[PDB]
């Protein structure tokens, strides 16, 4: 991969480990052990105890029903979009544009008020993140397909 630096490192480590002696004190230290125990203690980095502690009671079911309705709407619209894809006929070219316009209108009509409501109630859950990712993926796929269609005409 790289230059002879890899061989130089191999020779260096071979020479270093040629004269090797076991060690006892240098293996572990009290501070390192305490830090590892704290990390492995409940609520630590590797033992994060939150894991949506009260997700069943957070974001009350009134919002949850609206979130489920938005999920169903997004799923249906994206199902129509992916059924249209791939575009093999000129008729489907305008249908995908209409689907994109409908997706944008739905986003502006619902997600923005939904985001405002979440900000007002200050919910830490990233519920909008999944919908935003799905919409961004659909938009990127449509843009890539349009670019390829333009490239094919060049």
């Amino acid at each position: 991969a790289t230059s002879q630096d890899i061989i130089n490192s191999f020779q260096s480590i071979r020479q270093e480990m040629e004269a090797y002696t076991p060690k006892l004190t240098q293996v572990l230290s009290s501070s390192a052990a305490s830090s590892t125990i704290t990390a492995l203690s409940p609520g630590g980095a590797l033992m994060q105890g939150g894991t949506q502690q009260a997700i069943n009671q957070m974001v009350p079911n009134d919002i949850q029903s609206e979130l489920k309705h938005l999920y169903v709407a997004v799923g249906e619209l994206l199902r129509h979009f992916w059924s249209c894809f791939p575009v093999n006929t000129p008729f489907l070219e305008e249908k995908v544009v209409k689907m994109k316009s409908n997706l944008e209108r739905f986003q502006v009509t619902k997600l923005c008020p939904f985001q405002e409501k979440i900000r007002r109630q200050y919910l830490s859950t990233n519920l909008v993140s999944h919908i935003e990712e799905m919409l961004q993926t659909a938009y990127n796929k449509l843009h890539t397909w349009q670019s390829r269609r333009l490239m094919k005409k060049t």
Binding site: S30, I37, S41, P42
Partner: protein
């Protein structure tokens, strides 16, 4: 009794002195439960105490009973001591001496347990592992035959006195040989490591009479427990008393030595097994035992609870009958001991089955055991002369308070008490009427 029970009753100073030897610490750690070992390993490299709640959060709530038992056992063994954490909290930290010795045993450091072995070169009269095993087996067979009372086996006077002090055999009159009691039969039926451990515990208990250091003896025994088989060790570096104790071990077969003044001693397999073979008994569903043994000791042990049928030069065919089991029980051997002995000596072929022994045979033996204890007899005095319930209730309450009551029946106003408390009950009854 086991090692933990013996160590529980020792003073903190003795326990601390025991922890000064790395071999003792390893044995104590291995004697710990599975959960305790993980806690010891986690706290091995900690220079600061930990909160009690933090330790308690390691184990789940469902298994909190095991956590409590392990914590109590560790506190009793004084492996760790509670530290007054600043702010009113309680910190848990292992004993510094015990932790240091455990790290030395595991990681390394310090001087070796034995002084040296190559200073004197190879042994001129060194033996092999099979020879050492044969010597240990011969010594153990001689000891057990002397317990039986066979004239072919003769041991030292102090060894015979030790058995008398242990209660296995009683000497009714001086000069006459002692007779083995029921406790002797129970000891014989025990497993060889269990017998060795019980004998060592009795020796430790009686060592106070000789004024020998318990800590030194325990450390030497634990060092012998982890000693490699077939490797000699230096006699030098030990006190005069311990060597004498070692000489007693020479009589027990645990340690083999050519001469008393010799500087080399070879620990044997029995000494290694003290810290903790294939079995030679085949059990059949038709109440028949096939034993692959030739020594008279095993034949006698089997004939204690069974009827012998055939003795081929390398085989013993016996039948387990109701009469033989009843006779063995009358001799003082319980069915559980017989089952444990059969399981320990069970042939490796029988180990293939999911149960070591067939359930039917064990159930039949247990039922035969309950035959003797089917009838309950209680000598005593029966009171049935109660005119009124109130008078009966007061006397019954007084008898219960005295703890001499055997049986009570308020429906018929009849009671039965021990003869010893009969005088007290009569005195109480007389006083109640006279003072009325």
């Amino acid at each position: 009794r086991n090692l933990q029970e013996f160590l529980g009753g020792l003073s903190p100073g003795v326990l601390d002195r025991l922890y000064g030897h790395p071999a003792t610490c390893l044995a104590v750690f291995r004697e710990l439960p599975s959960l305790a070992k993980n806690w010891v390993m986690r706290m091995l490299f900690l220079e600061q105490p930990l909160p009690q709640a933090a330790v308690a959060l390691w184990v789940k709530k469902e298994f909190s009973k095991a956590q409590e038992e392990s914590t109590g056992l560790l506190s009793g063994l004084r492996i760790w001591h509670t530290q007054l954490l600043p702010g009113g909290l309680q910190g848990l930290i292992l004993n510094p001496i015990f932790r240091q010795n455990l790290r030395i045993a595991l990681l390394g450091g310090g001087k070796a347990w034995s002084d040296d072995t190559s200073q004197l070169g190879p042994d001129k009269h060194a033996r092999d592992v099979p020879s050492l095993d044969k010597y240990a087996e011969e010594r153990w067979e001689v000891v057990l035959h002397f317990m039986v009372g066979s004239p072919s086996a003769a041991v030292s006077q102090d060894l015979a006195q030790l058995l008398s002090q242990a209660g296995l055999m009683k000497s009714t009159e001086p000069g006459e040989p002692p007779c083995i009691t029921s406790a002797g039969f129970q000891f014989l039926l025990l497993d060889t490591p269990a017998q060795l451990w019980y004998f060592m515990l009795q020796y430790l208990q009686t060592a106070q009479s000789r004024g020998m250091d318990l800590v030194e003896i325990l450390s030497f025994l634990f060092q012998l427990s982890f000693s490699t088989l077939g490797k000699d060790y230096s006699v030098e570096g030990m006190s005069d008393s311990l060597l004498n104790f070692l000489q007693h071990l020479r009589e027990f077969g645990l340690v083999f030595q050519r001469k008393r003044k010799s500087r080399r001693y070879y620990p044997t397999r029995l000494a290694i097994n003290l810290s903790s073979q294939p079995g030679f008994i085949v059990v059949e569903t038709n109440y028949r035992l096939y034993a692959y043994t030739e020594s008279e000791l095993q034949i006698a042990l089997i004939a204690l609870f069974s009827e012998m049928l055939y003795r081929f030069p390398n085989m013993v065919v016996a039948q387990v009958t109701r009469e033989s089991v009843q006779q063995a029980i009358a001799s003082g051997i319980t069915a559980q001991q017989i089952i444990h002995f059969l399981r320990t000596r069970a042939h490796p072929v029988m180990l293939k089955q999911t149960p070591v022994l067939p359930p039917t045979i064990t159930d039949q033996i247990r039922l035969w055991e309950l035959e003797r204890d089917r009838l309950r007899f209680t000598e005593g005095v029966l009171y049935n002369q109660f005119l009124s319930q109130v008078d009966f209730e007061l006397l019954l309450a007084h008898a219960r308070e005295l703890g001499v009551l055997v049986f009570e029946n308020s429906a018929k106003r009849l009671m039965v008490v021990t003869p010893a408390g009969h005088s007290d009950v009569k005195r109480f009854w007389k006083r109640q009427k006279h003072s009325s």
